[PDB]
Amino acid sequence: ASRLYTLVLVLQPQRVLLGMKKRGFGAGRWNGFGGKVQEGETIEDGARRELQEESGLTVDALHKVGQIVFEFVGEPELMDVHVFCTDSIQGTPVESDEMRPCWFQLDQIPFKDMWPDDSYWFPLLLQKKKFHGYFKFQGQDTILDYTLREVDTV
Numbered sequence: 310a311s312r313l314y315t316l317v318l319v320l321q322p323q324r325v326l327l328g329m330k331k332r333g334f335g336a337g338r339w340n341g342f343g344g345k346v347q348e349g350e351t352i353e354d355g356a357r358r359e360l361q362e363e364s365g366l367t368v369d370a371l372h373k374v375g376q377i378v379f380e381f382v383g384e385p386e387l388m389d390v391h392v393f394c395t396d397s398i399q400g401t402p403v404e405s406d407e408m409r410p411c412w413f414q415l416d417q418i419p420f421k422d423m424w425p426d427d428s429y430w431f432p433l434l435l436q437k438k439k440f441h442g443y444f445k446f447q448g449q450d451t452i453l454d455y456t457l458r459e460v461d462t463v
């Protein structure tokens with residue numbers, strides 16, 4: 310019982326693009342760009358589509374960097390998030406009614422205003438490591454248990 314989601318991090322040598330979600334699931338937190346994968350669409354195609362919808366950016370090749378499964382206690386469906394990175398995009402980040410994008414220097418990533426699990430795996434992403442993670446949440450703020458391991462093949 311898991312649902313497929315994507316997450317895209319535009320990660321350049323000295324900065325990363327995050328977006329402040331304005332409403333819905335995850336509102337009020339900085340994050341990468343992503344969402345549900347649709348019928349008849351590959352995971353990577355869904356990731357590329359979500360980046361365009363939410364940031365206005367066009368990406369060619371995405372690189373698989375991680376998979377994180379999220380459990381929210383009391384909710385039946387696990388969220389199976391496939392995480393991708395790119396350093397090459399086209400277009401300018403656009404603010405919309407749904408999303409406010411902003412570039413961050415790697416030393417100033419706003420972990421206090423992000424999902425709490427990001428503090429665990431984002432540093433692996435910054436050092437170009439790949440990972441498999443599982444996080445059990447109570448509500449949206451409390452990590453009850455987790456696992457996180459580096460891998461060679463996502």
Ligand SMILES: OCc1csc(-c2ccnc3[nH]ccc23)n1
Pocket residue numbers: 314315316340341343344345379388390424425426427
């Ligand atoms: O569709 C994207 C999506 C679904 S669930 C989720 C998520 C849940 C909990 N912590 C998180 N940190 C970064 C992303 C994330 N992102």
